[PDB]
A paper describes a structure:
The tumor suppressor p53 acts as a DNA sequence-specific transcription factor regulating and activating the expression of a range of target genes in response to genotoxic stress. This in turn initiates a cascade of signal transduction pathways leading to different cellular responses including cell-cycle arrest and apoptosis that are known to prevent cancer development (1–4). p53 binds as a tetramer to specific response elements consisting mainly of two decameric half-sites separated by a variable number of base pairs. The majority of tumor-related p53 mutations, particularly those defined as mutational ‘hotspots’, occur within the DNA-binding core domain of p53 (10). R273, a DNA-contact amino acid, is one of the most frequently altered residues in human cancer (6.4% of all somatic mutations), with mutations to histidine (46.6%) and to cysteine (39.1%) being most common.
Numbering used by the authors: 96 to 288
Write the structure that this text describes.
Amino acid sequence: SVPSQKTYQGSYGFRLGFLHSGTAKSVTCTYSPALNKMFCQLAKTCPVQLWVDSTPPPGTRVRAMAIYKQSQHMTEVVRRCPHHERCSDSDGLAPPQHLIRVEGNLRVEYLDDRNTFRHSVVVPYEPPEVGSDCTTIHYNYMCNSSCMGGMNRRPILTIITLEDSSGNLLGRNSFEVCVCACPGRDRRREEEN
Ligand SMILES: [Zn+2]
């Protein structure tokens, strides 16, 4: 019933990478390789890189979806808290309830699953930019992890899926995410164990 989170590289050798951003006070987004966990700020650019060994055809799509990490909460749909959804932060594309947005891509598509009610955001796959070995997507997380009513400090996974134009699954990967005021300090803190 719960969406699969099993890693699969598949035919194209698909995996994720992240900027090596460090943990200074001013970083807005920082990834910990030890924890496989992203720490980022509400509404700020969160670059996720897509790495492939061979190029997928045009038509290929890239989906992102959040699920709760813990088993007791896994079947609960991850959505925004009431204070955040019912606030004028819309971009005219994203449904107000969706945690994950994509910025700087007018081909963005949002889905409420007709059967699971789960939210996801999908953008066209595009090959790497000139002078770059990966494809970057800028995600936005629109709720703090601390938001009472929403996640309420409960840890979440973001699952990134590569799909062909006909919806066939090509590859999958995932990472944990914390949305917080001081990503840098918080990453340092959580690695201390
Ligand atoms: Zn919130």
